[PDB]
Amino acid sequence: ANVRLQHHHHHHHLEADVAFDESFFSFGGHVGTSVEYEDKVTRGFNNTDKKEKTITNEVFNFFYNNPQWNFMGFYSFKIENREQKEPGYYENEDGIKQLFSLNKGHDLGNGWATGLIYELEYTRSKVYSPDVSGLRKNLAEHSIRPYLTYWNNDYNMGFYSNLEYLLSKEDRNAWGKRQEQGYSALFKPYKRFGNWEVGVEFYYQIKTNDEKQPDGTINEKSDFNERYIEPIVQYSFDDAGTLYTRVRVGKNETKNTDRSGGGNAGINYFKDIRKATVGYEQSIGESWVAKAEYEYANEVEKKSRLSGWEARNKSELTQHTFYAQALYRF
């Protein structure tokens, strides 16, 4: 699932007959632009620093929805540039990323609703390194999410919930193929009181990883699971903006099979995750919505057994993300 979009799906629901022809011209929504800067330092098992910098230019993001139809959609176009530096290596990656999302809802009455989300992200990119010049990578990520919601007006509480089937298939030409397949479940109880909103996201995911070289040699065959809990608090100022924060605490595990490629056969990876986001959103006059967001992320990984080459059983990622967004409503 696309994280930024998923929060739109959640909170648009909270925003809550003519003939087809008139209805066809009754979509509202927005058109907008964003920029995201991501500063990544990973101190891996080699005890050295892998530094990564990514700028994402969203030239167009399109939200459209039709209340009578109980139907929303989303399209996105992004240009992506990544530079990676580490001792004795570098890697530059340029890409175009498209996102398609469809949401069909259904009102079940008395607070209940249900629906289907289908979401598609295609990414194509070229990589430049000392060893490679213009290696093509094609990523297709499919996300199908049936959901179920409830809201109660007397108590101004409810929840969001969904399952997800997730499929990602990346082709990296000379570097082989990687397919990830899996399921997840999300439960998100939520409550509003005065200018406050509060919720907690509960999440679980189980996934399968398969990565082969072109000649069919197995790089990785592994099982993965993740869980996290993420409280969210939010406060709207009477005049007028909205400040919000998310804190995530999570764990995941990657357990390699006997068949896993050099040299991870039967090796387990354990990762502790901690994330913090602060954001502020404000409408400007009647049409424009502006948004800025900062996220800190820290992830620490250890493996079940050292193979022999590692300088330390510890791999730590520190990540800063900055995001700005301007949206024009219609």
Token pair, residue 170, equals: 């990346």
Token pair, residue 289, equals: 């919505």
Q: Which of 254, 253, 294, 247 is nearest to 274 (CA)?
A: 247
The Cα 37–Cα 322 span in angstroms is 5
Tell me the technique behind this structure.
X-ray
Torsion of CA 235, 238, 242, 244, to 10 degrees: -10
The DSSP code sequence of 216-268 is: S-EEEEEEEEEEEEEEEEEEE-TTS-EEEEEEEEEEEEEEE-TT-TTTTTT-E
Chain Cα centroid distance, residue 176 = 24
* Residue with token string 């949206």: 327
> Residue 137 pairs with which residues in a beta bridge?
125
Q: Resolution (in Å) of the shown entry? A: 2.5
61, 76 Cβ separation under 8 angstroms: yes
After what residues is the chain interrupted, C–N > 2.5 A?
16
Q: Which helix (H) or strand (E) holds 319?
A: strand 315-329
The residues, any chain, with a CB within 8 Å of residue 288's CB and separated by 6 or more, are 326, 327, 328, 329
The Cα 318–Cα 60 span in angstroms is 29
324, 284 Cβ separation under 8 angstroms: no
Q: How far apart are the first and last CA of the chain?
A: 26
The Cα 214–Cα 32 span in angstroms is 40
Token pair, residue 261, equals: 């490629």
227, 206 Cβ separation under 8 angstroms: no
Q: Which of 204, 295, 297 is nearest to 253 (CA)?
A: 204
List Cα–Cα distances, 41 to 27, 36, 78, 106, 274, in angstroms: 43, 17, 23, 44, 15
Burial group, residue 243, by CB count within 10 angstroms (0-12, 13-18, 19+): middle
Token pair, residue 164, equals: 């997800």
Instruction: Output DSSP code: residue 11.
Output: H
105, 114 Cβ separation under 8 angstroms: yes
The Cα 277–Cα 164 span in angstroms is 24
CA-derived radius of gyration, the chain: 22
CA angle (304 as vertex; 300, 223 as ends), nearest 5: 85
